[PDB]
Design a protein around this ligand. Structure first.
Ligand code: ADP
Ligand code: ADP
Ligand code: MG
Ligand code: MG
Lengths: 55, 521, 529, 89
């Protein structure tokens, strides 16, 4: 990391080894979440809300 | 004791400790602007509370942006605006000369010398210094027309040597000189418009012998009307051409629908009457400070004529002065004289924006600059250097007397005072001698910045001046001394004369202070 | 430990936060010390060599002053005893205009000397009687000291010598140049018939060159700019209006009502035609410039440009009245064609620029005119204001000279003579009032001591030499400033004088301040808030 | 007595300052970081960046001007590179 700061407080940067790591973690996370609802014998999920008045 | 004279929190100091502390305080102010002097000077970057940054080389501008609260230092700030408001050039020269006057008499104050003796010393040499400048100033009162156009260029280039645009000083000097020679005999500064458009190289700047301004907000239908004319007639207006209510204090009461329909058609007949009155005058370009409705624009489109609304006031006055018409608040007396004539009108794209150009007027009294930079602070700094060239030419028109710069003038004055102090006896010998020593700060600060041996050059300069070489200054490129009058380093006589009086008055005022009282809040 | 339990009576009933002083020790000895402290503050600001002083008020404004009355106004005092002296000095400025520091030095010295008399056994009643007798005896002596007279107060050369001393104590080094300027301005606003009014001298400050480039303009100047396209006039006939330059309307609410198509269309045309005739009627009388104290309209401005009428606007209710005097015109409350009597005249009106500022100039070629203006050019705001105060002091001296023409020698020669003659009278008064009389004469010396101290020489050598010379019969011998070794000089031949009325009021108000303080016996103070 | 704390500038303690070569070297380090961030995105085989907005919006882009526009920077020299990119655009 260069000793000089270029970003305001709260801003963050990620690069090659860390950037491709984060992007792949997110994608497979959403893919594995919904695989259970696929095909003629998939099951259903429950969605309950903390914000929208416990819908 | 139980009842104290002045309220609690009052600060009071006096004596020699107070006066010496004021001398040292002014040294900090002269430090902020010290290394911004010379053909090889730098800039400074200042950031205010909100985060906006300003990059500047102008000496008066730097001192304004500092938040000085020291009462004695504020004197040096004010004389900067004094040189700024009278001649416009020499704001740093009057600051270094102010600090050097005080520093060279500081040991005498420690010895207990009465300040009123010090004050009499400064005022004695200044009348001698000023009267020396006027004697040896060079001028040619015979009116040669091409020499005048050369003298003004030399003065203009020398005012641009220490600025960001030094590499193009020969190109800009020609532009500035041409601007002033056709600006009437009162030379209003508002008669020159400076515009700033991003994108492009510095050499793409141009001067238009006319009026050019930005495209304004236009309604639906602005795009089916022609954008070029060869001999149009311009009708300047101050009347709002849109369908509206006559008076804010009006009121209509009616009984029958027959009059109702007649009233509805009355508003349209009013609007169509004004627009038919303009179209019959033969004008092709109409400009108004007030809004122009969409109905007018669509109507102006059907007859191949150009409309523009919400034009700024200043841009309209320049257009009147360049074209030669007059502003009309009514559309009942459009004679042939109240119209403006130009040789060509067009609308072009400049760096992403659209600009209106009125060029070709042979009787113009106004110019306009289009400045091309790469960033906001790049053209703002460009215009600040242009303003120094404009004011210098304005003064040179009224009085065409020049002296050689580059430290040549500061060594002729110092030698003269040194040859006059030896004639008078007493403590008046040491004070004038110390005064003459303060005048060789300018040649030292030029060599210190460039990076030479400042001690050797001064010794060479002092010997040449006392040998009998009046106009010998410093040679920046060659690291030596040379005659700056044959090297074309000129400046008007007003710049130096106004530098001494303001500097002498600031030094005298500060020394004459006994005690300072600050009361709470 | 134990405590002292707040002895009964008035002490136990007094509200918290309040104070109560009683007796000589806690009331008079404290007040004298408080007054003595105030004198030492402005004592160094006395005389031609009096050093400047720098004051920052509670609003971060910066003042560099030599004037004593100015310093006290911006200094803020809290002791009641010092306030009494302050009100005395402010009264002297209003009544005369100069000598605001003579009061502080004299009133301060009187109280200091009255301390020892109370210390050795005298009472406050006997001290006051001794002071008052000397005050009456001082005034009887004073007319005998007149040594010169103002001959003709409309002679430029003579007057400049009269005001030079009044400026010598303010701007040592530039007294000659400033004396010449004020002489020209005052001598040419002079009326034949008497009543020199002082407000008729205007000062305009413009930043720029040194002070030697300031000049005097026989007329008025404003920091404004023209509205129309006309800029300069060569021989102007002026019309002055206190009303807006626009079509008038009813003060009661008034709306325009229309019922037919024709009235809707003909309203706008009718209004414009009416405005054209009104302006043309004005131009029919020959007016070249119109000045108004209010808002202007666009239609009026357009027609004013068409008929070559110069238009200016300024709203002060005090600048316009001054302008009425300058050109001789009279105000008008309604937009009507002016009567030939009601129109002023001026030899030139133009728009000019001076030091990065736009100004409008009403210049007379007449030497007298009605009022005059002095333009100040300096390098700093603080420099102008101090010069502005000097111009006021010089003018106020000219005001006094009109009231009375008698001058007395200055430089300490007047106070030395008074001290010599009061003591001679004080020697022939038996009783316990002889001591206070001699003390009063001894306080007059401080003014020659104060000048000598700041001059950087020993005070006792000068005072000893002044007494020895004055015994030989020289009434015009005073302190010499130019000499670095203490010496004396003749004042009448050196042209150093001051107004007789300046001394007459200064002595009267100074003693009145001292005896007023001595009459106090106890102080009751309410708490601050 | 000679150098007792005397105030010259409002809030004198809270302001910093850099003079001399250490001023120029600090600018160079700031300028280099901006160039090394966007060295990758040059040429047909270049790669892109995924911007993230103040509120959460996602934008994937390869244009030089936009990356420097959506970027939030503090160093004054960095803003000078942003204005340089826009002027060319
Ligand atoms: N060609 C040159 N050779 C030597 N000195 C020069 C030359 N051009 C300008 N200077 C120097 O630049 C100095 C002032 O530059 P400038 O920025 O105008 O000062 P200020 O900020 O006081 O107006 C002058 O003292 C002059 O000696
Ligand atoms: N040329 C002079 N030489 C000596 N004393 C002078 C001279 N001119 C003026 N003075 C002294 O200056 C005093 C008044 O100056 P000033 O400071 O204005 O006092 P004040 O505020 O009481 O008017 C006078 O008492 C006079 O004696
Ligand atoms: Mg310059
Ligand atoms: Mg006086």
């Amino acid at each position: 990391l260069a000793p000089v700061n270029i970003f305001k407080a709260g801003a963050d940067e990620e690069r090659a080894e860390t950037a491709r790591l984060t992007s792949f973690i997110g994608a497979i996370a959403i893919g594995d979440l919904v695989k259970s609802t696929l095909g003629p014998k998939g099951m259903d999920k429950i969605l309950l809300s903390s914000g929208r008045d416990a819908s | 004791t139980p009842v104290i004279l002045l309220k609690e929190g009052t600060d009071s100091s006096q004596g020699i400790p107070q006066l010496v502390s004021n001398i040292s305080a002014c040294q900090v102010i002269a430090e902020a602007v010290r290394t911004t002097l010379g053909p090889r000077g730098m800039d400074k970057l200042i950031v205010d509370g909100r985060g906006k940054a300003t990059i500047s080389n102008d000496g008066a501008t730097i001192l304004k942006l500092l938040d000085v609260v020291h009462p004695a230092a504020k004197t040096l700030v004010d004389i900067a605006k004094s040189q700024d408001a009278e001649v416009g050039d020499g704001t740093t020269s009057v600051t270094l000369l102010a600090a050097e006057f005080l520093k060279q008499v500081k040991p005498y104050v420690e010895e207990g010398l009465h300040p009123q003796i010090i004050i009499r010393a400064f005022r004695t040499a200044t009348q001698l210094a000023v009267n020396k400048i006027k004697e040896i100033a060079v001028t040619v009162k015979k009116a040669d027309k091409v020499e005048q156009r050369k003298l003004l260029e030399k003065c203009a280039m020398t005012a641009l040597s220490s600025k960001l645009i030094s590499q193009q000083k020969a190109f800009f000097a020609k532009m500035v000189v041409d601007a002033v020679m056709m600006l009437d005999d009162l030379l209003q500064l508002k008669m020159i418009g400076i515009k700033k458009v991003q994108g492009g190289a510095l050499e793409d700047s141009q001067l238009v012998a006319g009026v050019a301004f930005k495209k304004t907000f236009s309604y639906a239908g602005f795009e089916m009307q022609p954008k070029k004319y060869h001999n149009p007639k311009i009708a300047l207006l101050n009347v709002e051409l849109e369908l509206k209510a006559e008076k804010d204090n009006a009121e209509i009461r009616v009984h029958t629908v027959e009059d109702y329909q007649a009233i509805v058609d009355a508003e349209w007949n009013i609007l169509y009457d004004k627009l038919e009155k303009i179209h019959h005058s033969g004008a092709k370009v109409v400009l108004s400070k007030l809004p122009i409705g969409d109905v007018a624009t669509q109507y102006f489109a059907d007859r191949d004529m150009f409309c523009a609304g919400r034009v700024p006031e200043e841009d309209l006055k320049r257009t009147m002065m360049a074209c030669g018409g007059s502003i009309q608040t009514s559309v009942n007396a459009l004679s042939a004289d109240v119209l403006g004539r130009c040789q060509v009108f067009e609308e072009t794209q400049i760096g992403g924006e659209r600009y209106n150009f009125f060029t070709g007027c042979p009787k113009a009294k106004t110019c306009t600059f289009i400045l091309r930079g790469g960033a906001e602070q790049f053209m703002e700094e460009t215009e600040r250097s242009l303003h120094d060239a404009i004011m210098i030419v304005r003064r040179a028109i009224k009085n065409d007397s020049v002296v050689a710069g580059g430290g040549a003038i500061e060594m002729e004055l110092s030698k003269y005072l040194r040859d006059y102090s030896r004639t008078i006896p007493g403590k008046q010998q040491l004070l004038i001698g110390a005064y003459a020593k303060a005048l060789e700060i300018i040649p030292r600060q030029l060599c210190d910045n460039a990076g030479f041996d400042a001690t050797n050059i001064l010794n060479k300069l002092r010997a040449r001046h006392a040998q009998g070489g009046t106009w010998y200054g410093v040679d920046i490129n060659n690291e030596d001394i040379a005659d700056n009058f044959e090297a074309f380093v000129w400046e008007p006589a007003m710049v130096r004369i106004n530098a001494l009086t303001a500097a002498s008055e600031a030094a005298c005022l500060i020394v004459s202070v006994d005690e300072t009282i600050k009361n709470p809040r | 430990a134990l405590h002292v339990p707040k002895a009964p009576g008035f002490a136990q009933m007094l509200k918290e936060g309040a104070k109560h002083f009683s007796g000589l020790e806690e009331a008079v000895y404290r007040n004298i010390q408080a007054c003595k402290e105030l004198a030492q503050t402005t004592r160094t600001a006395y005389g031609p060599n009096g050093m400047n002083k720098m004051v920052i008020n509670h609003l971060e404004k910066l003042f560099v002053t030599n004037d004593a009355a100015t310093i006290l106004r911006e200094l803020e005092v809290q002791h009641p005893a010092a306030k009494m002296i302050v009100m005395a000095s402010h009264m002297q400025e209003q009544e005369v205009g100069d000598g605001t520091n003579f009061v502080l030095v004299f009133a301060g010295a009187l109280l200091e000397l009255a301390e020892e008399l109370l210390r050795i056994g005298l009472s406050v009643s006997e001290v006051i009687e001794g002071y008052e007798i000397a005050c009456r005896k001082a005034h009887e002596i004073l007319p005998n000291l007149v040594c010169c007279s103002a001959k003709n107060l409309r002679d430029i050369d003579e007057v400049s010598s009269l005001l030079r001393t009044s400026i010598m104590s303010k701007q040592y080094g530039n007294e000659v140049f400033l004396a010449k300027l004020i002489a020209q301005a005052c001598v040419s606003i002079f009326p034949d018939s008497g009543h020199f009014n002082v407000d008729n001298i205007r000062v305009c400050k413009i930043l720029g060159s040194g002070i030697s480039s300031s000049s005097v303009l026989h007329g008025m100047v404003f920091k404004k700019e023209t509205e129309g396209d006309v800029t300069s006039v060569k021989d102007a006939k002026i019309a002055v209006y206190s009303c807006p330059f626009d079509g008038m309307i009813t003060e009661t609410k008034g709306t325009v009502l229309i019922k037919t198509a024709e009235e809707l269309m003909n309203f706008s045309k009718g209004e414009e035609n009416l405005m054209d005739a009104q302006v043309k009627a004005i131009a029919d009388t020959g007016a070249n410039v119109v000045v108004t104290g209010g808002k202007v309209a666009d239609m009026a401005l357009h027609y004013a440009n068409k008929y070559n009428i110069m238009l200016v606007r300024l709203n002060s209710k005090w600048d316009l009245r001054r302008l009425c005097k300058t050109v001789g015109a009279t105000a008008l409350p309604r937009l009507t064609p002016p009567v030939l009597e009601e129109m002023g005249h001026c030899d030139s009106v133009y728009l000019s620029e001076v030091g990065d500022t736009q100004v409008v100039v009403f210049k007379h070629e007449k030497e007298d005119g009605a009022i005059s203006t002095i333009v100040l050019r300096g390098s700093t705001d603080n420099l102008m204001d101090d010069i502005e105060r000097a111009v006021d002091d010089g003018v106020n001296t000219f005001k006094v000279l009109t009231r009375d023409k008698r001058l007395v020698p200055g430089g300490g020669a007047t106070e030395i003579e008074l001290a010599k003659q009061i003591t001679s009278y004080g020697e022939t008064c038996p009783g316990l009032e002889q001591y206070a009389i001699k003390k009063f004469a001894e306080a007059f010396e401080a003014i020659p001591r104060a000048l000598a101290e700041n001059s950087g020489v020993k005070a006792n050598e000068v005072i000893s030499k002044l007494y020895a010379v004055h015994q030989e019969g020289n009434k015009n011998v005073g302190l010499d400033i130019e000499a670095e070794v203490p010496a004396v000089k003749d004042m009448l031949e050196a042209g150093i004088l001051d107004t007789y009325l300046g001394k007459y009021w200064a002595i009267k108000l100074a003693t009145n301040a001292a005896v007023t303080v001595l009459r106090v016996d106890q102080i009751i103070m309410a708490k601050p808030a | 007595e000679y150098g007792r704390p005397f105030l010259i500038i409002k809030d004198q303690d809270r302001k910093s300052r850099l003079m001399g070569l250490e001023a120029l070297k600090s600018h160079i380090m700031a300028a280099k970081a901006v160039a090394n961030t966007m060295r990758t995105s040059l040429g047909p085989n270049g790669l892109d960046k995924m911007m993230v907005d103040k509120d959460g919006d996602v934008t994937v882009t390869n244009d030089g001007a936009t990356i420097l526009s959506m970027m939030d920077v503090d160093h004054q020299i960095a803003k000078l590179m942003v204005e340089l990119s826009k002027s060319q655009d």
